[PDB]
Design a protein around this ligand. Structure first.
Ligand SMILES: [Zn+2]
Length: 46
C-alpha cells in the first residue's frame, strides 16, 4: 500500500485547501466555498 489511486490525465483544477480535484473551474469554485466561508471551524482562506 504505497501508491495511491492510479489514474490518467490529472485534472487541471485542484483544491489546495483540503485535497480535492475538478475537471472544470466552476466545479472547483463551488467547492472552495466550503473553505472560503465564515465559520468557527478552522483556518479560513481570507
Ligand atoms: Zn477542498
Amino acid at each position: 500500500g504505497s501508491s495511491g489511486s492510479s489514474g490518467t490525465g490529472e485534472k487541471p483544477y485542484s483544491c489546495n485547501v483540503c485535497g480535492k480535484a475538478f475537471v472544470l473551474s466552476a466545479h472547483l469554485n463551488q467547492h472552495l466555498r466550503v473553505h472560503t466561508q465564515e465559520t468557527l471551524s478552522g483556518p479560513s482562506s481570507g
